[PDB]
Design a protein around this ligand. Structure first.
Ligand code: FMN
Ligand code: 8K6
Ligand code: HBA
Ligand code: HBA
Ligand code: HBA
Ligand code: HBA
Ligand code: HBA
Length: 347
């Protein structure tokens, strides 16, 4: 029995979720050439409105954030209007939805933004080329200046302002999976020697400035944050990263966020540096609402939540394979297994 997945969950005084099931953020690369959400995307999200909360696909805050084709933005008026169609449709279906605010940092590619500079904490290139594209090899980033950083914080904040007009219920800040914010939090990517590098406090500074700037626009009850304390996605490991997160997590708790959400693909994986799984590490260092994710079945998620491992379950791939995931779980019906080939279709 997975009855607990259907518990009401009060995130805070502003938002109550009708169940504990989140749609995980899932990049689909289906926005139009102006990175405006399409009417097909409207229908796609609308049919998943039985989720307690949808986290949108990663949505770029400005042009030099783009690293994959046709990933939507939230920085132009047309993009805002396109997202308003999405959020209106989700709300009309009785759902709720947060936008996931993205900057890819060193994982951006200048093909998408007129040959401009890729930005990151340090001039540390990742290996390889953009997946599913022809020959877009990653480039050495420019190490951001403090002025670049001020502009990036400003643009995260402006993107958050824009979510009001776009009609989202809130923002998940994408601080995970090797992207810009996570790049400041890990030694592989952050080799800085200024006030944004070196020590846990300094390496956490960018993340906290972005969190605080966004709270100043939309409020703590509408702000969540995804983190990846375990390096796995465009990030080499470093044994010193754990103490960065040991500092960051209690600082985050002071902000009384809507949630922290783990970014991982299989949370059954143990990280030596974290003393175990990513979720168990965070749960041991953070005492507010936690969203688990990564290769959970409804059954294993339900058990984890019953065992106080985390509070809410995000479901990714099964929500692609099963638009009616929530109803099928509710009714104990067969679920289709995900395959990567399903990404070809937006259903
Ligand atoms: C096709 C695909 C795209 C994804 N896009 C994002 C993304 O936009 N933002 C993000 O934070 N995670 C992204 N993820 C990771 C998922 O949110 C999730 O953490 C992962 O799929 C594990 O959960 P699952 O086992 O339920 O699928 C993506 C995963 C997949 C498979
Ligand atoms: C878009 C569909 C599939 C996406 C590709 C996979 C992305 C996640 C895996 C990346 C690297 C994982 C290897 C983990 C190393 C460290 C584990 C302790
Ligand atoms: O470069 C950032 C940017 C922000 C808002 C826009 O409308 C266009 C670009
Ligand atoms: O470049 C195509 C590609 C597809 C799936 C992957 O997992 C990796 C790369
Ligand atoms: O963060 C989104 C938001 C939406 C409606 C509001 O009234 C305030 C904030
Ligand atoms: O596959 C695309 C992808 C984008 C953002 C993520 O965080 C993870 C995966
Ligand atoms: O939408 C494409 C698709 C591909 C393979 C499947 O098994 C199901 C759907």
């Amino acid at each position: 029995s997975v009855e607990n997945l259907f518990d009401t969950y009060k995130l805070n005084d502003t938002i109550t979720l009708k169940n504990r099931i989140l749609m995980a953020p899932l990049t689909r690369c289906m926005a139009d050439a102006n990175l405006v959400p399409t009417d097909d995307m409207v229908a796609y999200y609308a049919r998943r409105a039985e989720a307690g909360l949808i986290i949108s696909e990663a949505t770029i805050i400005r042009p030099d954030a783009q690293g994959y084709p046709n990933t939507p933005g939230i920085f132009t008026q047309a993009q805002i209007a396109g997202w308003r169609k999405v959020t209106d449709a989700v709300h009309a279906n009785g759902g709720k939805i947060f936008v996931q605010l993205w900057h890819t940092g060193r994982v951006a590619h200048p093909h998408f933004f007129g040959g401009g500079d890729v930005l990151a904490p340090s001039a540390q290139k990742i290996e390889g080329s953009v997946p599913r594209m022809r020959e877009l090899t990653y480039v050495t980033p420019k190490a951001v200046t403090v002025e670049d950083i001020q502009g990036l914080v400003r643009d995260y904040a402006k993107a958050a302002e824009n979510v009001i007009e776009a009609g989202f219920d809130g923002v998940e800040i994408h601080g995970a999976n090797g992207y810009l914010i996570d790049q400041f939090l890990h030694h592989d990517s952050n080799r800085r020697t200024d006030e944004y590098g070196g020590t846990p406090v300094n390496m956490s500074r960018f993340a906290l400035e972005v969190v605080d700037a966004i709270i100043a626009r939309i409020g703590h009850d509408r702000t969540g944050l995804r983190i990846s304390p375990g390096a796995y996605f465009n990030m080499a490991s470093d044994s010193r990263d754990r103490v960065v997160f040991d500092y960051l997590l209690p600082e985050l708790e002071k902000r009384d966020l809507a949630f922290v959400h783990i970014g991982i693909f299989d949370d059954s994986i143990e990280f030596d540096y974290l003393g175990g799984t990513a979720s168990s590490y965070v749960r041991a260092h953070y005492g507010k609402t936690l969203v688990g994710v990564g290769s959970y079945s409804a059954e294993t998620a339900s058990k984890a939540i019953a065992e106080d491992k985390f509070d809410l379950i995000a479901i990714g791939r099964p929500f692609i394979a099963n638009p009616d995931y929530v109803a099928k779980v509710r009714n104990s019906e067969e679920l289709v297994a995900y395959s990567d080939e399903m990404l070809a279709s937006l259903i």
